[PDB]
């Protein structure tokens, strides 16, 4: 499964995710509402974050 | 000097900044290009961040 990936500061790339089936998109739940991170897997997320986890290639754009 | 303030996850408020003359806006230098934080002062910033520091009330919107 290929997923977009980046931290809040790093650059947005496309990776393969060995051993994972999901991709994630973390976003700010409160305005500004924006994406804070994308990556492999489905991490547990701290408060204030909306977490979306999907299973097809490139689904986390 | 009153400045907007928030972390990447906390809520956006308006604060007074005792003892500071500047407000800051941290942003992502690389796309998505977006604001990651606002607050009192002019902090030193890690790589990948565009830092703007201003001196009038509410200048960091």
Chain B touched by A31 (CB under 8 Å): yes
CA distance B28 to chain A (A): 6
Chain B touched by A9 (CB under 8 Å): yes
- What was the elucidation method? X-ray
By DSSP bridging, strand B23-28 and strand B13-16 are: unpaired
Question: What value, to the nearest 5°, has the Cα angle with vertex B32 and ends A29 and B53?
Answer: 85
Contact A53, A40 (CB under 8 A): no
Quote the CA–CA distance of B20 and B1 in Å, as a whole number.
7
CA distance to A23, A61, B52, per residue, from A14 (Å)? 11, 10, 30
Quote the CA–CA distance of B2 and B34 in Å, as a whole number.
22
Domains and CATH numbers, chain B: 1-61 (2.10.60.10)
Q: How far is CA A60 from the centre of its chain?
A: 6
Quote the CA–CA distance of A27 and A45 in Å, as a whole number.
10
Three-state secondary structure readout of chain A:
CEEEEECCCCCCEEEECCCCCCEEEEEECCCCCCEEEEEECCCCCCCCEEEEEECCCCCCC
């Amino acid at each position: 499964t290929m997923c977009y990936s980046h931290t809040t500061t790093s650059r947005a790339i496309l990776t393969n995710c060995p051993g994972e089936t999901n991709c994630y998109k973390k976003s700010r739940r409160h305005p500004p509402k924006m994406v804070l991170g994308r990556g492999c897997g489905c991490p547990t997320v701290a408060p204030g974050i909306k977490l979306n986890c999907c299973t097809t290639d490139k689904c986390n754009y």
